[PDB]
Amino acid sequence: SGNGAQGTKFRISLGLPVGAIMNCADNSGARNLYIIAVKGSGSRLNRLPAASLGDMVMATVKKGKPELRKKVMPAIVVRQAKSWRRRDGVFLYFEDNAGVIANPKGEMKGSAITGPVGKECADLWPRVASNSGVVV
């Protein structure tokens, strides 16, 4: 959430703590993301910051195009792989973890997004909705 958040997000179960590595879903040339922080997270003793679908995280690319490595950059997750609950009572989960590299105010670095993206994420970030292939 934050600057680009066009609306508010109901809490959904956190499945991505710090240190998690997720596939890169865009065409920016990066292949995976390494989470080191979560924007707008609280503080509690020994509580590891965690990310859920639709959040904005500060992350670095661990392996990929050299002009991207060794620097921090914002990212937005689009796939979780941990079951969470909508209002409908349906429990859903992808089969992997996926994120997209973006600037601090929500501009995507890529142009297209591979694989499905969560509805809560599309509804929260209009730009990834536009650049989104399939929305579930």
Binding site: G7, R44, L45, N46, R87, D88, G89, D123
Partner: protein
Amino acid sequence: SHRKYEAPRHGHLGFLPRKRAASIRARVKAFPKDDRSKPVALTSFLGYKAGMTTIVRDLDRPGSKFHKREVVEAVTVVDTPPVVVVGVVGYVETPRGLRSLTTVWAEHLSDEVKRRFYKNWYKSKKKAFTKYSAKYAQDGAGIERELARIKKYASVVRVLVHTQIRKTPLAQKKAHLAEIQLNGGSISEKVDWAREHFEKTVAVDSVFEQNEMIDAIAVTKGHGFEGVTHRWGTKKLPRKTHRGLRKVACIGAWHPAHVMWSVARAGQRGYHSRTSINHKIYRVGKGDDEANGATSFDRTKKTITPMGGFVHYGEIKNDFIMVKGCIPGNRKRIVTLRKSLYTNTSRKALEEVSLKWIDTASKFGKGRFQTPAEKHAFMGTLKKDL
């Protein structure tokens, strides 16, 4: 030295001591402030917790992303057969608090209620109120003076009610007895209203209403002696800890040379009394009526009880109260339902609720069907069938 890293307190200090409750029936310690204008009516009711189920309804909340869309919610049902009124009592103010001064009883007491006064019922000559009944048979001599006393004094009036335990599937046979404060005006009519209601019953509908926010008061579920970690949620010690790791490391500094009262310690867990507020009613059901689980949107004749009946309880052949969320206490425990103490707008407490669908699948497993007719339709004929 100072604590290295700050951290919030563990546990809440407003609920000590964590000891077993005095009685299995939690006592209500506060009633809604009386208004001397409304008609005389009760302020609470008695019921037994049955179970929980799931509901689908259309949310009505302008502004939220799920305005006018279906959502699912978890609700719990309390079996509430009509109570029986037996006698009233009055309280007068004193510089040392409210004090009772006179109790009156109805002429005839049922067995299920007079069993409350015996610890060994089967060996007894059933000599209960057998001389009190002799106070009748004269016009009003021994009683009308008592009522005159209560009218002259006793600013606050409470009435005695008892549950119809035999109407429930329980194996209790011993009814529950409790006090409910009346809430009309001009106590003389309060006691009048009680007079003709002696030995008569009161349906829960006469007290509660749809979409009304209420309070649940009951004794929570017990678990026996419990370790400090699960009793208070404190951090677990590292693995390579000699002499146990399910403990608390430092139970106090050197000075003061005692362990403070604020340090988490092992002991009893559960069976405390708890008061939970702001619960919305979703459906007041009438027991002498099939299709309780039917809605205006579903329209299939089925009762509220699930397939195979509520686990550990049975059926709901009586009236019932259906409330959003969770209430303290486990199934088969007595529960008191109390009206709100204050006008709560909240833009939520006054939201009208209209159910779409009520789940009745078996809770004894991963039930797939809603009605035996549906099950037969889906599965076709079996070997058991002719």
